[PDB]
Amino acid sequence: PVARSWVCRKTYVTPRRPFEKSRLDQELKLIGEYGLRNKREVWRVKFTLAKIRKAARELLTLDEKDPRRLFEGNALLRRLVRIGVLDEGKMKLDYILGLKIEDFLERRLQTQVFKLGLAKSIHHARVLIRQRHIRVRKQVVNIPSFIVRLDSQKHIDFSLRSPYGGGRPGRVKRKNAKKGQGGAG
């Protein structure tokens, strides 16, 4: 006996066919479009949807005005509407099924850095997060898979311990100050 959890799950499912020419086609485009690193980065969003989507499939088959279906209905909508995917006026648990993987990758903070103009490319936007240059409500986010919320969308700006914001210069420019006056006298 030990005071431990052991509770863990896989967040991705591997594709049944390892070399579908038409699957490699799409999944490699979704990497280049939203600046991902591997297929695992794609597959886990495919699985988070297929979870969300599977819950909605089950509620649609329940009786109309079931207390579970009504309560669990609004939560699954509010969960999607908060993260800014499904519309605030089209919050109906049928429209959850009519929903795709690009609707989530748009709410990935890597893309939301790039689509706010404080990066130049999506592959640069990942550098600006992984090298802790940004923050969400004065909280430095190091991780580009930070699925941004709707009210928490307009608080994404640079860090205050970074030169790209209102902060001190890094290492390369601070070795130029050693050589700038070092060679002069």
């Binding site: 006996p1 030990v2 005071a3 431990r4 959890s5 207390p67 009504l70 309560f71 609004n74």
Partner: protein, 262 residues
């Protein structure tokens, strides 16, 4: 085991203590006493998990050993004393008194009471015994043995004991229309009038209890604790008044306490 159990595992510990998962292997096993292992709450949990006067296990020891804690009027220095239902915990130095009534969900409601209300409590009688010289006896839910009771007190009733003397003052006889705290099963912590006493020879009598909102349910006769005559209680109820709003209704009144609060 080949003898009695002295350890309780944190996982096998009952849910309504709401002890977390990750702090330790063991839970505080209640010492034997007036209340059942599951249906009680140890002093240690009331003194650092519910009220947070202590932080660690030694801190709970270094509070109760000064005799500051006074469970129903008679001081216990036992950190694993089973402080169960209706028990009147009296912290005299901070000047706070607590009756242990159930919340409408599993847990015990941390309910503050007036020091006048901390003088008496309510006890459900469990059986009538006749003693060794025709002396009649009561036994209560909290093991209190009272003798020479009122002859109109039967063995599903409740009695109003006094902490100073340990003697009955008034009682609520089990009739229809009288209030009822449900002290067990899925309906743990409901309040409402008794509308049908349904008799089953051999098996257990089910009793239908109607809530203030007409939210009618049923419970076995074992899990009934009559707290008043008609729609008027003899005690101080916890906030919400044991009415049990549903998860659809609990969400609307949680969010309006964030919306209108900000």
């Amino acid at each position: 085991a080949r003898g009695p159990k002295k350890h309780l595992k944190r996982v096998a510990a009952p849910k309504h203590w709401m002890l977390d998962k990750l702090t330790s292997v063991f839970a505080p096993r209640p010492s034997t006493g007036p209340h059942k292992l599951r249906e009680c709450l140890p002093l240690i949990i009331f003194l650092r998990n519910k009220l947070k006067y202590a932080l660690t296990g030694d801190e709970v020891k270094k509070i109760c050993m000064q005799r500051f804690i006074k469970i129903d009027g008679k001081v216990r220095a036992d950190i694993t004393y089973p402080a169960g239902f209706m028990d009147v915990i009296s912290i005299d130095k901070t000047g706070e008194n607590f009756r242990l009534i159930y919340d409408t969900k599993g847990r015990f409601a941390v309910h503050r009471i007036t020091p006048e209300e901390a003088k008496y409590k309510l006890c459900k009688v469990r059986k009538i015994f006749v003693g060794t010289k025709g002396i009649p006896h009561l036994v209560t839910h909290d093991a209190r043995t009272i003798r020479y009771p009122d002859p109109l007190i039967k063995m599903n009733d409740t009695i109003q004991i006094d902490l100073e003397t340990g003697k009955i003052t008034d009682f609520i006889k089990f009739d229809t229309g009288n209030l009822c705290m449900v002290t067990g099963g899925a309906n743990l912590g409901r309040i409402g009038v008794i509308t049908n006493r349904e008799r089953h020879p051999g098996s257990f009598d089910v009793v239908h209890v109607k809530d203030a909102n007409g939210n009618s349910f049923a419970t076995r006769l074992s899990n009934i604790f009559v707290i008043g005559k008609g729609n008027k209680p003899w005690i101080s109820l916890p906030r919400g008044k044991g009415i049990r709003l549903t998860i659809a209704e609990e969400r609307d009144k949680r969010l309006a306490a964030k919306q209108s609060s900000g």
